[PDB]
Design a protein. Structure first.
Lengths: 379, 382
């Protein structure tokens, strides 16, 4: 019962144009998945997010556990019915002060009080009440020594316990999360153990911790080389435009990050040349749009100068315009990547993306040049 | 501004103002309200969400206190404020002060008036004021005026007399400057009736301003906490009795439904819509009914209250707004507890739509000669 269909592949690198069959519709891959919890906090309605072409977004299990709680989400006909989101949803396990034992993750109450145990079983039960289309296993995430290997094997045992507790694989898709940190021997072990489990998808965890970029993309490529070709590959916590393009070339299919929503609050708007810091003086008389090639409502209607005026005012709409546009940039980038894979022009697309972003190839980040060269894309 | 009245039932002017705008192809129903904006934007609502609201007025209110500090930018833009803020299709009346955040008093002389924006204070002489209107190019704009004789503190008769003379001197100065600019002549000046709480000065301001070729009148200084007082309600009557019937009457600082109906009886046509904005800012939703055929006020519910944590009904059953057709009280309550901006967005959509539908009931009631029943229905809900 495969949830992913491969539509096109790059004949030179690992890029994959695919499609996910989920209970709330089909999702084109590669896909960046916004964190809908932050989108609504940003003031973006369901209709706006839908009009941008988004067909899958994330919900934060721990946040929904604090408010309004899973009991209310159940009464509200799941998270779909609560926020009135018609398309797909992905929720985390809810694990990531928090002590970890074999029983599960322990949450202390502020200023003393009863603890709260989040076991693998309860993570599945909580996520079953939310009703998301894709659910994530509970894993043991460590910050280096014996604790790294200890947490990896516990993540495997917790994977088996989530699979056992997950009684409705026809309605929710459970993803495993590859551990091992930056240790190649541990990560390879976790890849060997977790791929034996019949889960519909796989996620790559532990790769947004502040490591070096060389160790970053090498752990990505090690993961994608051992993950099943006929199942999606989910790289968590990756949102920068360069990182997306590079990790698509390494074989990743799904991505999530709070980055687009965050910098929208900082006045910055994403563009093919990097970002525009629209709060700065230089945009006070810039009567052009953010990006005339962007189809979002902000770029079809407003100028940089007007957004600059709103940023120097009490109007919350200044954040709405940028949150709308930044999400649209992420969707536009990943759909343009997908078209290049369908049209067998992905390397030329990557060379043009890097050239527009950095200029001369000698100014490209060294880690990205190595990663792209490892899959046959030269600059 | 060619104004046409359908009838005047019990002092309420039912009609329509035709041939408005650059193309002259816009109309405005009276009595009605203007779309409330802040820095050229409806609060919490982009141009995209603004389209999700039924019954948005065709004329929007701008405030100099939010736009004066952007004078140099709009001057370089040259194309006008409506095009600059991405609302080229709407009508715009630029008022002097914001009704909710007007700033401190005591900056009015016979040489300059100050407004207050996000960046700070902007001092405007009559020259500077008309230079700013030239960059904005609004359809209508309130003439620079002195309205600080109308204040809560013990005001003097000499001060009320001064506000009349000062505003008239301002009015005559702006008219001389208007006829000296090609751009500024396309805009319509609105005279401002001042005079404080002194009857003789109120009547003198109304007669002297009506002598000028203004396109309408702004009734300034009638705001009231909690509402327009009986003393100022009577002052309002005496003023409008001195004004032509063929020109619109605007009022500032009067947006609550009870005092709106009170001022319509006095012959006031156009109102600001900042009351639904205030309801939104305190996390409330207007629920007062206006169907006549079957800090928080009683017209609303506070969705921060715990009784809505499980309430899966809409804000108002039968409301056709985006929030009530797609979301529940429990979702609105949750957004307010987690301090999410979608609460302000969804609340503002409903509060604007409910408020605009209230002004449809006023015009409908005037068609059927039933404003008495409507006023008693609004007042029975306090
Ligand atoms: Zn855009
Ligand atoms: Zn509603």
């Amino acid at each position: 019962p495969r949830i992913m269909r491969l539509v096109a592949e790059c004949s030179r690198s690992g890029a994959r144009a695919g499609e996910l069959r989920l209970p709330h519709g089909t999702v084109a891959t590669p896909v960046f998945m916004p964190v809908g919890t932050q989108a609504t906090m940003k003031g973006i309605t369901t209709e706006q997010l839908d009009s941008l072409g988004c067909r899958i977004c994330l919900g934060n299990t721990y946040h929904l556990g604090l408010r309004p709680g899973p009991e209310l989400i159940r009464k509200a006909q799941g998270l779909h019915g609560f926020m009135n989101w018609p398309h797909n949803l992905l929720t985390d396990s809810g694990g990531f002060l928090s002590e970890v034992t074999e029983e599960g993750v322990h949450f202390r109450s502020p200023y003393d009080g009863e603890e709260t145990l989040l076991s693998p079983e309860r993570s599945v039960e909580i996520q079953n009440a939310l009703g998301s289309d894709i659910i994530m296993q509970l894993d043991h995430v460590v910050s280096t020594g014996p604790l790294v290997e200890e947490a990896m094997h516990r993540s495997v045992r917790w994977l088996d316990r989530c699979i056992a507790a997950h009684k409705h694989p026809d309605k929710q898709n459970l993803f495993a999360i590859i551990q091992g940190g930056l240790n190649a021997d541990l990560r390879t072990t976790c890849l060997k153990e977790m791929t034996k489990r019949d889960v519909p998808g796989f996620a790559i965890g532990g790769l947004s911790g502040g490591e070096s970029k060389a160790q970053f993309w090498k752990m990505v490529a090690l993961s994608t080389s051992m993950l099943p070709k006929d199942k999606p590959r989910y790289l968590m916590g990756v949102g920068y435009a360069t990182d997306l393009v590079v990790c698509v070339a390494l074989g990743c299919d799904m991505f999530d990050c709070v980055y687009p929503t965050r910098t929208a609050r900082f006045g910055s708007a994403l563009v093919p040349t990097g970002n525009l810091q629209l709060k700065k003086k230089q945009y006070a008389k810039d009567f052009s749009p953010i990006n005339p090639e962007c189809p979002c409502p902000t770029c079809q209607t407003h100028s940089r100068a007007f957004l600059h005026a709103l940023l120097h005012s009490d109007n919350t709409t200044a954040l709405h315009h940028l949150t709308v546009h930044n999400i649209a940039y992420q969707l536009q980038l990943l759909s343009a990547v997908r078209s290049s894979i369908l049209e067998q022009r992905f390397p030329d697309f990557v060379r043009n993306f890097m050239r527009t972003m950095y200029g001369d190839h000698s100014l490209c980040p060294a880690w990205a040049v190595e990663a792209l060269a490892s899959v046959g894309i030269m600059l | 501004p060619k104004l046409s009245l359908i009838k005047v039932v019990n002092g309420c002017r039912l009609g329509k103002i035709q041939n408005l705008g650059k193309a002259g192809d816009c109309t405005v129903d009276i009595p009605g309200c203007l779309l409330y904006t802040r820095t050229g934007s409806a609060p919490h609502l982009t141009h995209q969400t603004l389209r999700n609201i039924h019954g948005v007025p065709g004329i929007a209110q701008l405030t100099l206190s939010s736009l004066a500090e952007h004078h140099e930018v709009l001057a370089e833009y040259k194309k006008g404020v409506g095009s600059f803020i991405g609302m080229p299709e709407s009508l715009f009346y630029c008022s002097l002060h914001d009704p909710v955040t007007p700033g401190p008093a005591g900056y009015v002389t016979s040489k300059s008036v100050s407004v207050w924006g996000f960046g700070g204070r902007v001092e405007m002489t009559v020259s500077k004021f008309m230079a700013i209107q030239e960059a904005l190019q609004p359809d209508w704009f309130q003439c620079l005026s002195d309205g600080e004789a109308s204040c809560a503190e013990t005001t003097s008769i000499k001060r009320a007399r001064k506000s009349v003379d000062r505003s008239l001197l301002f009015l005559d100065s702006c008219l001389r400057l208007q006829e000296e600019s090609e751009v500024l002549q396309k805009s319509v000046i609105i005279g401002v009736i001042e005079g404080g709480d002194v009857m003789e000065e109120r009547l003198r301001s109304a007669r002297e301003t009506a002598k000028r070729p203004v396109g309408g009148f702004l009734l300034d200084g009638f705001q009231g906490d909690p509402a327009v007082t009986e003393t100022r309600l009577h002052l309002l009557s005496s003023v409008t009795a001195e004004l032509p019937e063929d020109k619109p009457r605007l009022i500032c600082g009067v947006s609550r439904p009870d005092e709106v109906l009170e001022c319509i009886e006095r012959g006031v046509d156009l109102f600001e819509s900042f009351f639904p904005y205030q309801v939104t800012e305190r996390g409330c939703a207007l629920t007062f009914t206006f169907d006549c055929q079957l800090e928080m006020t009683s017209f609303e519910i506070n969705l921060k209250e715990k009784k809505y944590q499980e309430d899966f009904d809409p804000l108002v059953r039968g409301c056709s707004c985006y929030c009530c057709k797609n979301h529940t009280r429990a979702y609105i309550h949750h957004l307010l507890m987690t301090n999410e901006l979608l609460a302000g967005v969804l609340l503002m959509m409903h509060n604007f739509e409910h408020y605009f539908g209230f002004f449809c009931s006023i015009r409908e009631a005037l068609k059927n000669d039933t404003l008495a029943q409507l006023k008693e229905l609004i007042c029975r809900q306090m």
